[PDB]
Amino acid sequence: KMVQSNLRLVVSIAKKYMNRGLSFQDLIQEGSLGLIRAAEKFDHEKGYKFSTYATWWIRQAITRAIADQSRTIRLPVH
DNA sequence: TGCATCCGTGAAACAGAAAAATTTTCCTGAATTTTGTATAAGTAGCTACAAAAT
């Protein structure tokens, strides 16, 4: 009831990579993945909203997808 | 219900990490020649020799 509760914003992020590559939907997922992870690695004790932390993990997730594939010959993401 | 529309055809992050890989080293081991080396005769040579054709 939180990961989904967010939903939007992650699409505002993923959509930035919908044109970068992969696929709007493809992205969305990826984020989602992240979303999760964040969604729980996350600590309301530091107060400031997940908007300044959830979006972190997202981004991460994503990048690791158009770089992890979307190329049909995987190269050292590094 | 013939008669609408109406499917869809043929033409970009990073630093930090670690862990992998890999890969150079080794070594080694062995396996594998060569050579030594015997080896063992037999030998095919070879060297005089002899009588009898230049």
From Swiss-Prot:
Residues 2-72 are annotated as: Sigma-70 factor domain-2. Sigma factors are initiation factors that promote the attachment of RNA polymerase to specific initiation sites and are then released. This sigma factor is the primary sigma factor during exponential growth. The keyword DNA-binding applies. GO terms for biological process: DNA-templated transcription initiation. One of its GO terms (molecular function) is sigma factor activity. It comes from the Bacteria. Interacts transiently with the RNA polymerase catalytic core. Belongs to the sigma-70 factor family. RpoD/SigA subfamily. One of its GO terms (cellular component) is cytoplasm. Keywords: Cytoplasm, DNA-binding, Sigma factor, Transcription, Transcription regulation. It is found in: Cytoplasm. This is RNA polymerase sigma factor SigA. A motif (Interaction with polymerase core subunit RpoC) lies at residues 26-29. The chain holds residues 157 to 234 of 390 of the full protein.
